């Protein structure tokens, strides 16, 4: 028996785990993700080619699809960051923080990309260019607190298959978009990432930019077990793709700080938090090298942190080296 | 609608090529049936989590249905046999034209590993103009020995391509005169020409190797990887990208430049990739785009296949990156 | 609110308390069966020899049963003649009964360009089916169902899904007529018109005039008079697909009048009262039009026989009233 | 899928039944039609600033132009009247001219359930081509060079209804392809279609009865007589020329668009609508007449020439001809 995402969501709304309002939000998010998938797939055809330009259109489809729930503002990127869409329910009960695509690099989107989203229960209203100023950004950062009011997080990966991964806070559920019917079909319940995994995913091209602690860590992954097999290295360049592969097969994915990016590249609130919340629901761990990501409260407008994420035993191992 | 633009489907594009007499009507039908098989393989890849919730290494079973899809789609052209997978290799389909004018060597999927097909995978094919017949559905030893003497990458390889199944479905084709890029239009069910005469950059600061094997490599290879990491005077080292999907990793290289490597190591003494099925069609595509395909010493396309599942190290990509690697291994 | 899907619109009706969560799911499940029936109707030539409208009626009823499995059990009222077999779902809670016409006919001719499903949702006072062809309901379950579903008093919602050049889901939960268009790219029904109102007049008449020599003298005159060009010199336009859903949908949108009257051969009309006439009359009235049997309001008639039939005159209020004057 | 349109085209080209050039053209047409099918299905959604049959006529002509731009230049014949603007493509080579009706009407009422694109491909004896409106003299050239009676090589339609069906004849019988909504490909579903020889179905706008000639009035009134069989003819009339025609093709019967007090010479246009459909019907074993003569015998002289049309099952059409004589 095939359960669609919509049926599953109406069942959760029927058992009262989620409200009607929240149900609407999730269902609209998944309708935006189907439209973005189609943009991503036809991009070569549509351009007759920038991942940055796609970033923008995707924010507009998001806005349209969540317009019946609330207003959407845009946190513009003056760096190489994706522009972030922030939706605020007309009601005040929910704020949705949406990364349309997971990078702005063509190179890193060659084979995969994905949207990332986090839904919060705010205690203040922040939304008044579609761009948000510094003041609205400050408000967002103070009201969205991953370690205390993050209710639901998910991603949609656009790659050889289109995969919607959700967690309202009870386990992780995987939904696969069926291309024949255009519906997201439940294909995995209570996904669990393995405890251990001999796969590491880092951009080893930056090794000479890393602290001595990390280098040793990396150098030892290449030592063959008594079994004679060293770790396997996989690194797509796509945050969702690489996260997704880790979540399923285990291992460790890392975006360390380096000599050029002194506090790392990933943003605490927009990228690291929704993914750390997912990996914890699946049984894994998200850390910055020393601390649990979701224990870091967001305090500043463009706060970045290093991220080590994946199988619990792989992440604990990195932290011993960095300690 | 707006101003206007030209949408060339693959069919029209093949009919143009026939009209110019670059290719035959027969070849036209083969290349077109190959692309229909890829369109159906693309749908099977996309729905695999759903169809595994019934039926109607999961990457292994997909390998096998793909090969049936390929036989069924080329049935008006020839008969298809299968070269059974050796170890964890993908079974290879071999079709021979009823006319005896062509042989297609089709690798349904680029691996049998789930890890490596997590985000992308793809079909690889080679079309040869044989001197004999090798069947005119497992191919046995005799048929496998015939295929190897008749299919010569250095001389009768007329056309080579791949179809990548990733966030887009891309069909990359060369018929001997430049590399052409078709994008599958999911709305309309056709491939549309979206790039002509692709050229791979002459250089590119991107390397793609599985560095987890670094301690299993030779010291000359290790020195080359180590230097790539040195920040030049601008302070930028090379970037590392390794999907683990040969088609995915190759496609990225072809578009943005750089180097892809699958070396031999203490465990795979002759590399992993197979010469005839994987390296040869890919080297032919790269040379038509302006790059190089080497085994670390020699031009892959100058190596005569003499043993079915023969393997070779592969260094493919940007002309100067490849040259630089062969300088460290000499 | 720019793009409102059917799931979101339903959840907003539930939030405003117009509907129940139970009904929300019954509705959303009906629409999924309609999505899959659409795809069957579209691919029907392929699925035979990449073709009978009769066979599609059967698979359509099984898709409906599968789609409504979590809400209740489904049985089938076997078709008397050339009538479509009707699926009947009884929610496990006893609160709702869904009466579903899978397709609007059993003829290929009449389904050459369009067909559609029709449903009515009733709030029952008793339990009919029980347990689980299986599907076929016996005489006794059938009578229960005809006794429990009373168009004039417990008919809560009704709709249809038309399968034509576009796929259109039309629904009324008691407060206006809402139109959802299937977005084939994204597999979802999207709100494309709210509170539809059928025009009060429209110079369009839809009847099978091959039957003219079989009709009664009062109706022949009415037909004959539509053909008189007026002072404007423009007589009425005749349109008649032969798809009940197609013809009704055109009528709802552009106005005019659709009729399937009694004749010498079919002494009481062809359309069934409960399965076809009632859901459509409730929709037309929610759009501000009229549904009559020529002398009386269809939803005032109580279904008393299993396959009871009635003549139907439906469409723009002024158009129905005019045929009603000629038949008095 | 089983035999697809693209496979079937490439075999015909390979049997030398059609050029490569013409195979490109036919292929581009079916692409345009799969995009138009899409526009038609999603019109209600598109029209929410993100409905008029006339707007869609326009967009469909631009789709057609982009899909055929590789084969030749596209120009538009407008009728500021109630006719669909017609796109006319002329190969760059000068070997072919396609005349394409994007949709079969500009009325919303008549497009309520179905609509369709209609095309004829001609092998011209001169070049006519130079915001693609053709001027008068380009229109006059098209009309003298497209001669349904002698150089009309291939005709077809694509119906947009509950099914999307591409009907094509290249001069050897009529082939029916169904669009597969799962896979996006047109699949061959019917080879050598033959319209039945008779059919007790008549398709006319009978609202106009009091405006038809006395000869036509009695033919209408006779179809309503039950034979000794007790069954009169069945009336069906969608209002969509493609849909009414397609049902007649498959199930037999007759379709008519007669002349009347208002439309002295009928409403359908000879070259854009009547000719291509007459060619198809003939290939399927039926008849296409103006009530007195074979449609494809009439040579077009005027830009927007209209003709009464009676088409369908040979016996039914002969039967009407008998009452009009």
UniProtKB/Swiss-Prot annotation, chain A:
UniProt: Mg(2+) 1 binding residues: 49, 78
Positions that bind Mg(2+) 3: 99, 102, 271
GO MF: fructose 1,6-bisphosphate 1-phosphatase activity; metal ion binding
Species name: Pisum sativum (Garden pea)
Subunit structure: Homotetramer.
Disulfide bond annotation, renumbered to this chain: 126-139
BP GO annotations: fructose 1,6-bisphosphate metabolic process; fructose 6-phosphate metabolic process; fructose metabolic process; gluconeogenesis; reductive pentose-phosphate cycle; sucrose biosynthetic process
Keyword flag Hydrolase: yes
Keywords: Calvin cycle, Carbohydrate metabolism, Chloroplast, Disulfide bond, Hydrolase, Magnesium, Metal-binding, Plastid, Transit peptide
Note: In plants there are two FBPase isozymes: one in the cytosol and the other in the chloroplast.
Name the record gives this protein: Fructose-1,6-bisphosphatase, chloroplastic
Pathway where it operates: Carbohydrate biosynthesis; Calvin cycle
Protein family according to the UniProt entry: Belongs to the FBPase class 1 family.
Main enzyme class: hydrolase
Residues bound to substrate: 102-105, 203, 235, 253, 255, 265
Binding residue positions for Mg(2+) 2: 78, 99, 101
UniProt-listed Enzyme Commission number(s): 3.1.3.11
GO cellular component terms, A-Z: chloroplast stroma; cytosol
Catalyzed reactions: beta-D-fructose 1,6-bisphosphate + H2O = beta-D-fructose 6-phosphate + phosphate
Subcellular location: Plastid, Chloroplast stroma
Cofactor: Mg(2+)
Cofactor binding comment, as recorded: Binds 3 Mg(2+) ions per subunit.
Any coiled-coil regions, as ranges: none
Major location category of this protein: plastid
Record's note on what induces expression: Light activation through pH changes, Mg(2+) levels and also by light-modulated reduction of essential disulfide groups via the ferredoxin-thioredoxin f system.
Superkingdom classification of source: Eukaryota
UniProt keyword annotation of Chloroplast present: yes
